[PDB]
Design a binder for these strands. Structure first.
Ligand SMILES: [Mg+2]
Ligand SMILES: [Mg+2]
Ligand SMILES: [Mg+2]
Ligand SMILES: [Mg+2]
Ligand SMILES: [Mg+2]
Ligand SMILES: [Mg+2]
Ligand SMILES: [Mg+2]
Ligand SMILES: [Mg+2]
Ligand SMILES: [Mg+2]
Ligand SMILES: [Mg+2]
Ligand SMILES: [Mg+2]
Ligand SMILES: [Mg+2]
Ligand SMILES: [Mg+2]
Ligand SMILES: [Mg+2]
Ligand SMILES: [Mg+2]
Ligand SMILES: [Mg+2]
Ligand SMILES: [Mg+2]
Ligand SMILES: [Mg+2]
Ligand SMILES: [Mg+2]
Ligand SMILES: [Mg+2]
Ligand SMILES: [Mg+2]
Ligand SMILES: [Mg+2]
Ligand SMILES: [Mg+2]
Ligand SMILES: [Mg+2]
Ligand SMILES: [Mg+2]
Ligand SMILES: [Mg+2]
Ligand SMILES: [Mg+2]
Ligand SMILES: [Mg+2]
Ligand SMILES: [Mg+2]
Lengths: 169, 296, 159, 211
RNA sequence: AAGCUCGUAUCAGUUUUAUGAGGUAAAGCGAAUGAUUAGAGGUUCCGGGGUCGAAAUGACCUUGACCUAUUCUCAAACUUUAAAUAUGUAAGAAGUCCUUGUUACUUAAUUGAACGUGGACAUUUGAAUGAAGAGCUUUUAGUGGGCCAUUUUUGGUAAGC
RNA sequence: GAGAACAGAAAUCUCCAGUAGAACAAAAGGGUAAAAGCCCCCUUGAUUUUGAUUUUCAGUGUGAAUACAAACCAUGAAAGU
RNA sequence: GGUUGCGGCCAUAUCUACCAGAAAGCACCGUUUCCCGUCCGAUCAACUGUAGUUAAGCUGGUAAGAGCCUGACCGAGUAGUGUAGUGGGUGACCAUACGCGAAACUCAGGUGCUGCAAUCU
């Protein structure tokens, strides 16, 4: 049965992978600030590569997580840019989904040649109610199979509202 | 689950399971050991915790000692006993937590005999105090807060219960800095605020600020405050009389109870599946290998 | 060169008892010790503080003193041709109450019972312990049981 | 430069494996332990004959391999390279040292020299499976590998079907019933334990109690 | 060597009983780690090769790696299990139970902890065997190259090493 | 393992599985999972006094270690450490 | 008998897959004025018990289930071992005498017990 099990969106997490720190990265932070409204979070390189031109702990890529209605907007507003067509991939067998778009200008958000042009990673975490059981302190449990988000259940949820397309096979 | 996930014999065999109350996310043993253990030169002297727990909107207060067989409840007070004392709603909140502690404080200290000596503070101006040792007479009852897995944040209601047990006359060693009105940026306690929380004036001010700025929400939540004709201003005297009510007769009314234990056993055992016999289970296999196997 | 440090040779000796790792269960600290108790010493690798030296592993002694976290034990360790008195300061995790006297404490309050319950009856006691005696005579029946005659079997191989 | 095999014949030292603590050891002269038709099915080769050791001694890899040749060679050229499965049952895991050579006896711990298999009394060295009609070819096969070894070993007719664990009638009883299904070179057996579900999936020809 | 204080007393290169400790031997490897022979069945948008091809997140052979259920063989410096021999403690009068004193320690508390005053029960008084007794003190010699045998066992092909 | 623009075997983001297969300066062996590991917050108990104890042992010394006593402090709501 | 709070033992309590759960409880659940914490009221904090739900947790049952536990003249008196001989054998090794005695294996049975306080057709 299906009373309380519906489907909420847990969170949407945008992320910008840039191959360095400094000006180019603090700009990618400005992009996500005025887009999220919440201040974003920087990430440091995990090790050193030198073909990717990075030293460990270098400050590579900012990102942010957004929850609730505010995520529905940046979902749809970016979903538009994809013309509401994903692939049979893009959906994890564990139930979430994500895509990516170059040129943040292509959803809202004017240009500013002092801020440049950046591409993004949109990723969207789906969970039914009572997902707290996994995340709380006391009595931390796991969600039963007849609750856990599947790929099927999410694609069928996606092909419905938003009226988008799955494509591929 | 997922095919290439899950688990082998090897894995499951050599797996050492945690304790029960750790597999249940109920008990923090690292802190349990450090709360329970007694100085080995005090021998059988019990070390009594104050267990303060919060269900969804019921408050448990137990003064508890330990034994290798189990624990031992000296006295216990639940915040759902507050109706007896004049609190019918919002018995979860900070000032509900306070009173429940004061209930547990008066309750034990009574059945101990330290009732008339060691009354604690009747005033409740909210100044910082712990109950002092009465000269040439029994030292106070000593009890240590068992917070459980509750997170320690400044203002949290787990320390509300502390304040009521401490103001009730128990000796419960505590610092100030986790009470609301603890100034972060100076070590200073605004008491005019802490009184506001002991009497509920943070909830009363929600009522008032939701009187003229919206009534859609003020009726949704704060519903019952209408239906009994209680609007904010009286909230202070409600609790102020509950304190009087508690110190007057703490003695713990048990429920009248209606239907003997044997009764509850009967009806509830209807709804409980019972196990099987190997003979019954052997017949279930023999059935399967009849049908499923032999080509219909 | 040689290596003689304090915990040398103790690899399996301080090991944890398979699938028994982790915290020590809480009873270990609820147990209560008084001067005069006999305790057995088994060191617990998980508690590095207050650890007995490996020589006292598997050794029984008598507590001479009791402190916050610890009991002192005295052990007769024999060096050369004599015994010397060693006193050890042990965390309670390394010490369990000894059952070595329980058959004596059982037998004292038992020998007290059959003492009173006999004398008040007019004596006839016999409360000292006796060893296993040879068994008495008996008559084994052939009823339903006739001897089944066995012989040695020949050589086989079966591999 | 190979010291006469007389020198390592007996088991005088604790097992000295190639290890993190050894590391320098050479390679076994015998690298292949399964010869002839080893893809063959369990039903194909009922007759099993072992080479069995009567001593507690040590067999060099160089004597192992040299015997493996002599036995597999005789068998292929008479009964044919598909007529038998020769299984060397003994792996030379234990390293023989040597003190090569100026001081004489100071600091005499040797360096790896060769490898040997440590062999029990009654422990099987070679195992061969064929069909009963090939017996006398197999037996003379091992009998010549005998000459390649130190110390008495005796050839023995197995009471067992091939390399299986079952005596020939007990394998037949189980195989004409449902319980036995093919694998690899070996077989698998239907267990009366475990999930009933895929116990029936595998072994479909049981659950009749007939042919 | 000199003794000295005592003496059925206390004593033991022994057993029995009760209760501990141990990771050697064996054993184990379709249990962890590490080694090792053989196949069988699976999984690749993905290690490489080849036919089809404009290609494909293409299909088809293919050989590897992995996964699954099996299979042959091993460990001084591996191991779930786990001996035999060897080993700690206990088997009473320095014991057991009652009553209720002392304190500055400890308890919420005459609560406890420790040490006691007063009271109850004798040698079948608490297993075996032995006991030309047990306990104690002082002072001083020589020695401080060792070697052999059964069993365990290291280095060495070995050795009367 | 399954997912996300440039992004590839290796960059950052997310979910699932995860008895520890990691990490804890260093050799190895113990030990450790709401920790003993990782991130953060507050600090100086790495302090004062002088005894006992364990290993090595002659039951000397040294090294190292343990459990108390008497201070003065740290930290935590607290038990504690 | 159920449930809850605090437990003891710490897999007969774990794992995998499904089914069932009355009343109460627990829970999920609603809000962000306040104390408090976050990149994000997801966690954490406060407020509501109002506005919803048995879906999840939780409890139980099912499975020739994985694991785990217990037992047995199942294996096996086997392997190993203390003791003995002017025992056997060139040796490697082995047999016997008086004792002690496993592990795997095989088979059968089992799948948490339980302390304190409160609560409940
Ligand atoms: Mg198995
Ligand atoms: Mg664990
Ligand atoms: Mg804590
Ligand atoms: Mg050394
Ligand atoms: Mg020395
Ligand atoms: Mg230390
Ligand atoms: Mg060297
Ligand atoms: Mg020969
Ligand atoms: Mg050893
Ligand atoms: Mg070993
Ligand atoms: Mg061995
Ligand atoms: Mg074994
Ligand atoms: Mg292995
Ligand atoms: Mg491997
Ligand atoms: Mg390919
Ligand atoms: Mg003895
Ligand atoms: Mg005598
Ligand atoms: Mg005499
Ligand atoms: Mg001299
Ligand atoms: Mg001299
Ligand atoms: Mg000298
Ligand atoms: Mg020395
Ligand atoms: Mg040193
Ligand atoms: Mg209900
Ligand atoms: Mg359900
Ligand atoms: Mg729960
Ligand atoms: Mg089972
Ligand atoms: Mg002999
Ligand atoms: Mg023998």
């Amino acid at each position: 049965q299906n009373p309380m099990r519906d489907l909420k969106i847990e969170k949407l997490v945008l992320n910008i992978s840039v191959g360095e720190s400094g000006d180019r990265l603090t700009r990618a932070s400005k992009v996500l600030e005025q887009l999220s409204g919440q201040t974003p979070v920087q990430s440091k390189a995990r090790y050193t590569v030198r073909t990717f031109g990075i030293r460990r702990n270098e400050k590579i890529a900012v990102h942010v997580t957004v929850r609730g209605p505010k995520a529905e907007e940046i979902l749809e507003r970016g979903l538009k840019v994809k013309e509401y067509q994903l692939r049979d991939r893009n959906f994890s067998a564990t139930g979430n989904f994500g895509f990516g778009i170059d040129e943040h200008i292509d959803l809202g958000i004017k240009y500013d040649p002092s801020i440049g042009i950046f591409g993004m990673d949109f990723y969207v975490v789906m969970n039914r109610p009572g997902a707290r059981v996994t995340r709380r302190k006391r009595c931390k449990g796991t969600v039963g199979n007849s609750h856990k988000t599947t790929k099927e259940d999410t694609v069928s949820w996606f092909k419905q509202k938003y009226d988008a397309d799955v494509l591929d096979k | 689950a997922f095919q290439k996930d899950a688990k082998s014999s090897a894995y499951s065999s050599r797996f050492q399971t945690p304790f029960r109350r750790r597999r249940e996310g109920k008990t923090d043993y690292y802190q349990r050991k450090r709360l329970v253990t007694q100085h080995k030169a005090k021998y059988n002297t019990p070390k009594y915790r104050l267990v303060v727990r919060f269900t969804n909107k019921d408050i448990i207060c137990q003064i508890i000692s330990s034994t290798i067989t189990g624990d031992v409840v000296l006295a216990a007070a639940y915040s759902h006993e507050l109706p007896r004392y004049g609190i019918t709603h919002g018995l979860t909140n900070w000032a509900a937590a306070y009173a429940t502690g004061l209930l547990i404080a008066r309750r034990t200290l009574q059945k101990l005999g330290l009732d008339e000596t060691y009354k604690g503070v009747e005033e409740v101006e909210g100044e910082y105090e712990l109950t002092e040792a009465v000269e040439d007479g029994p030292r106070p009852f000593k009890v240590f807060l068992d917070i459980g897995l509750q997170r320690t944040t400044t203002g949290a209601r787990v320390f509300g219960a502390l304040k009521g047990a401490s103001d009730g006359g128990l000796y419960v060693p505590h610092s100030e800095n986790r009470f609301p009105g603890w100034d972060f940026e100076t070590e200073e306690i605004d008491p005019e605020l802490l009184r506001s929380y002991i009497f509920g004036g943070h909830v009363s001010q929600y009522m008032e600020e939701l009187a003229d700025d919206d009534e859609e929400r003020f009726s949704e939540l704060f519903k019952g405050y209408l239906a009994d004709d209680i609007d904010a201003d009286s909230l202070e005297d409600i609790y102020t009389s509950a304190h009087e009510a508690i110190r007057a007769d703490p003695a713990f009314k048990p429920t009248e109870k209606k239907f003997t234990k044997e009764q509850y056993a009967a009806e509830s055992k209807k709804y409980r599946q019972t196990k099987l016999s190997k003979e019954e289970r052997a017949a279930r296999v023999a059935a399967k290998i009849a049908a499923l196997a032999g080509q219909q | 060169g040689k290596s003689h440090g304090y915990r040398s040779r103790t690899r399996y000796m301080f090991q944890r008892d398979f699938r028994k790792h982790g915290a020590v269960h809480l009873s270990t600290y609820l147990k209560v010790y008084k001067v005069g108790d006999i305790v057995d010493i088994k060191a617990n690798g998980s508690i590095q503080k207050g650890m007995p030296h490996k020589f006292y592993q598997g050794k029984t002694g008598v507590v001479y003193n009791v402190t916050k976290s610890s009991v002192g034990v005295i052990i007769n360790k024999m060096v050369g041709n004599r015994y010397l008195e060693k006193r050890l300061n042990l965390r309670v995790e390394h010490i369990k109450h000894s059952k070595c006297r329980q058959e004596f404490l059982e037998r004292v309050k038992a020998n007290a019972a059959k003492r009173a319950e006999a004398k008040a009856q007019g004596v006839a006691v016999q409360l000292k312990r006796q060893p296993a005696q040879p068994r008495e005579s008996r008559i084994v029946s052939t009823e339903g049981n006739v001897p089944q005659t066995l012989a040695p079997v020949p050589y086989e191989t079966f591999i | 430069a190979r010291r006469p095999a007389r020198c390592y014949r007996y088991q005088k030292n604790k097992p000295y494996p190639k290890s993190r603590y050894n590391r320098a050891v050479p390679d076994s002269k015998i690298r292949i332990y399964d010869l002839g038709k080893k893809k063959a099915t369990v039903d194909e080769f009922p007759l099993c004959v072992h080479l069995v050791s009567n001593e507690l001694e040590q067999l060099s890899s160089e004597a192992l391999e040299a015997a493996r040749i002599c036995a597999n060679k005789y068998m292929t050229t008479v009964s044919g390279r598909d007529a038998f499965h020769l299984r060397v049952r003994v792996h030379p895991f234990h390293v023989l040292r040597i003190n090569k050579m100026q001081q004489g006896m100071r600091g005499a711990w040797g360096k790896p020299h060769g490898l040997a298999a440590r062999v029990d009394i009654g422990q099987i060295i070679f195992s061969v499976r064929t069909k009963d009609s090939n017996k006398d070819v197999v037996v003379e096969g091992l009998r010549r590998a005998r000459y390649k070894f130190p110390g008495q070993q005796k050839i023995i007719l197995s009471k067992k079907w091939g390399f299986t664990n079952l005596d020939r009638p007990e394998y037949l009883k189980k195989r004409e019933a449902g319980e036995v299904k093919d694998d690899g070179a070996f077989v698998k057996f239907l267990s009366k334990k475990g999930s009933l579900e895929n116990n029936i999936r595998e072994f479909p020809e049981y659950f009749a109690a007939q042919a």
